[PDB]
Write a protein that binds this ligand. Sequence first.
Ligand SMILES: [Zn+2]
Lengths: 99, 104, 208, 83
Amino acid sequence: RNLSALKRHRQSLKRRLRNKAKKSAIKTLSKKAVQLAQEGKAEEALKIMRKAESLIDKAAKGSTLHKNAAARRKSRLMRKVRQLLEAAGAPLIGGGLSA
Amino acid sequence: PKKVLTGVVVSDKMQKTVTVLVERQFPHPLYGKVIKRSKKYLAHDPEEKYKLGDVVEIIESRPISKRKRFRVLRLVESGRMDLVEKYLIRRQNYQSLSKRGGKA
Amino acid sequence: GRYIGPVCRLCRREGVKLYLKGERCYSPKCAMERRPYPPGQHGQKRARRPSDYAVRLREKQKLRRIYGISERQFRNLFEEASKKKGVTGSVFLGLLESRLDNVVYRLGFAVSRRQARQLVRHGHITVNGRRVDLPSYRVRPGDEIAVAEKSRNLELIRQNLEAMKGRKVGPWLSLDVEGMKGKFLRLPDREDLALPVNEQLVIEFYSR
Amino acid sequence: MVKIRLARFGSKHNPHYRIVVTDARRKRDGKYIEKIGYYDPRKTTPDWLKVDVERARYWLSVGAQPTDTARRLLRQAGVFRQE
RNA sequence: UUGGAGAGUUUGAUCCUGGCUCAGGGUGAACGCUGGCGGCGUGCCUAAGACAUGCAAGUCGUGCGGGCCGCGGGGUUUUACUCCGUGGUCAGCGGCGGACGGGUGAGUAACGCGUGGGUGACCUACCCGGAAGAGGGGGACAACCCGGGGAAACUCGGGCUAAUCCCCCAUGUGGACCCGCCCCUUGGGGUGUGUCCAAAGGGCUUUGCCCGCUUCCGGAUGGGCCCGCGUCCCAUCAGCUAGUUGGUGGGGUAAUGGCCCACCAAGGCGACGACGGGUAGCCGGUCUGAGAGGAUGGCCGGCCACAGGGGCACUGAGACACGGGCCCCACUCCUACGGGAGGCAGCAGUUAGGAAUCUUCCGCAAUGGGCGCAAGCCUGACGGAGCGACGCCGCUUGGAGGAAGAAGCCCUUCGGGGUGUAAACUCCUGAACCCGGGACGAAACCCCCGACGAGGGGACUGACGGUACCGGGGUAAUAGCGCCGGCCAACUCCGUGCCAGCAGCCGCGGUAAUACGGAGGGCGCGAGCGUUACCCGGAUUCACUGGGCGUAAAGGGCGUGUAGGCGGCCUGGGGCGUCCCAUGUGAAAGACCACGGCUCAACCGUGGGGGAGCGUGGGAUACGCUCAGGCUAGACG
Ligand SMILES: [Zn+2]
């Protein structure tokens, strides 16, 4: 007993994958930008954060990132960075950081 | 209007949190006499200012911990253990009246 | 089963003449004439003192049996008579006298009450212009209770009105024989009723 | 999307409607927001329709698509007559 | 002041106590005897057992590409092949709906629900309004074609390709995040530098109009979380707790939060009943009651919870999602025994259980809802019919006349009384039944004019139903059940003989029965009447209103004093209780009053009024409370 009201499931799969490849994207890049500030790579750290901040707001554009969700993400990354760069001051670029 | 209550700090063993005894009076729903009931509300002292035996005002706030939905407003009257004692003795009496073993 | 059976049997049980047949309950025979003792093998027997309920009972019955209404409706009336401001008793009687069937009786269009109902359920009764077959219809004040155009030429109704030249009509009602019409002026007052009842006893009855 | 529509209140063969304002998603016979006049199909009384435009315009102003039938009634009231 | 009735029963007799019993009202009822009609309402209360069959959510070609079957037309002299337009059909990709509506009450004693509040801890699709913009570039996967696996359900792999699917880049009205400052004051607002983020097109009456698109502020509606108060029984349940209570950081969410994790601390609750057990969705209301109160929460409405049992997440504005998904379990079915397919607590229905609860009906006309520019599609939401005296309300089985009184049946003091105006018989009316006419509900969307605005004109369209209803004609045309000792309205004969039997209670019956069984007669009620069950009532017999304890049941064997309850005279402050005022709330339906609708009423509409409780503001201060001061009559020395 078939129902054409399963296409939704037939489609959910496509989105499941869809969202997945995007979120995991973030996770990784963030976790990359983070380890950089540890070592004190004030140049590329911001080079990556920027690639992050972009991905993030891009997921909010769609259905991936709830909305304010993206916001948390952003606050949790920049704040986590800046604090680290206290071990080796002076941001070379000054990309994702107002001052 | 955020609810405001008045009571006494009876517990001072917790970190940043203080137990407040809040007495309430009211006519009994059928027997009409004024019965006096009460409740302990866990307040929230950031600066560890409020001490035992202090009468404080409570004010409904943003949830903080499981069971601690109130912040302390101001102090009303410092220096009044007489109230706390009552809380304490009643507690003590509670150690009695069981099936473990009664003595003197 | 809105009753319908032996009539002057009740004229008999109550000890009070009950005008249930119109003509005849006037000729030496509504039965009460010459035979006042109640029905049954035991009519001629000595009657023991009637217990409080007993009296309240028969006094309720006398009323009910008069208009010949089923207890079910009688009760309902009394119930609604109690929700109205006024005297729980006189107001009762008011509604009772407000019935389409009854009105036709007082208006004289019918020999008796019983005959009145039929006159209605067979549609010989106009009301403000439209016919009506439901007797339980309550006539409001200022209504033009009439006769069916069709029914005017009736061997019955005709012989009845002929009698109305000589009889006065209830003080709260008017009628134009020459035109077989008649109106309901206002709710009649207890001081305006002739019944041989005692409302108080009827009310008392319903508080048991 | 809050609509403006009817609501049954008559009885078996005795239909009596209630022009009201309520969230789309609720029932016909469900808790409304603000009743604004009634309508009677059969029209047994000379007074078989009422509206109080003052409020009716509030809503449309705020954003409340009314029914095909509903709008019809509001038109008779003179809800939209800009003369 | 619109409101309150009691009786029987412990004795030889009396009074009190006291229990038992009854009369009343009510029901989603069931059972018995009886059973004509209509309107409105209502109908699994038990196995939240198991469930065949069908139907219960879809819809858009004015978002994109094709398959099948066929028709018309082009390029071909012709043929094959091919190009356009098109009908039908199918599914796919994409959008929107599936998170509503419908069921049900298992669980749940809880912020679950009620009520009043908070959100500087939040979201909100479509709708409305307001501001800004849509610039350039590229990609994937079905369908479709080719191949393989399997019994099956279904699945694998290779290749093509469109789009309002997806992704990149630029613009940035704006918006996000960090940091700084100004204001505010828990995560509110302003602002500056840095960084990051937009977007689709389609249709026509195609130089403009419609639909749709993007960012942002506002609105509206809807909802998350949180707090005060309220919320059943057992103490023959008294101590409960280890993420348990709190803290710091981190995670996670729309967001507060032990929600989760790590570490730190040792807490948190309980006789104002913790924990344990039992039971039960909550409420507006509804039943009863003079009231307080008790009982209840189906039908309708609101909130919650589950959708065979348990677990989990995805997608999404929203789900942890009854007719979507993953897993385990129990069950049922197909099976080549590897492995699968199922969930009526949707409608109807089946079976089981039971005292007991319906038609596999009609219609999509109306009202609503989804999708659509629309025509329109879906809509067992719904509107209707049908079945059930299950309730209620209305209706009938006739009316008038007619004996000092028929017959028959009963009673007798045998003379007569009774059934009884009852019949018969007289006349009159005329439900049923027959013919004819025959409905509101229904006017929109659409179309046309007008400016797709306002305004105006035109068309279509009923399940009920040929039903209601009107006209005409027209037959005299169902009655039953309980009861007749007291309570309790209604009394005789016979049969019987502590038997047979009645019986709510007291009791009745052993040859004289107003109490058994029939009969005449009588009372009560009438398409109904009884019965049993259950709720309130009587019962002031759990006693707030409104009880008691010498002997009727009842003072603790006595003292001590804990918690608690309660407390003297005068003065003042505060004004928490307490009282008055204003205000928001107290949805709707119901109840009430009034007016009206359907020939009445039941039923329904419309309008008015009332209210306890809580929020905020204002006021009063006797009395209670509190603080202060003073007294001496209580107490103590
Ligand atoms: Zn008579």
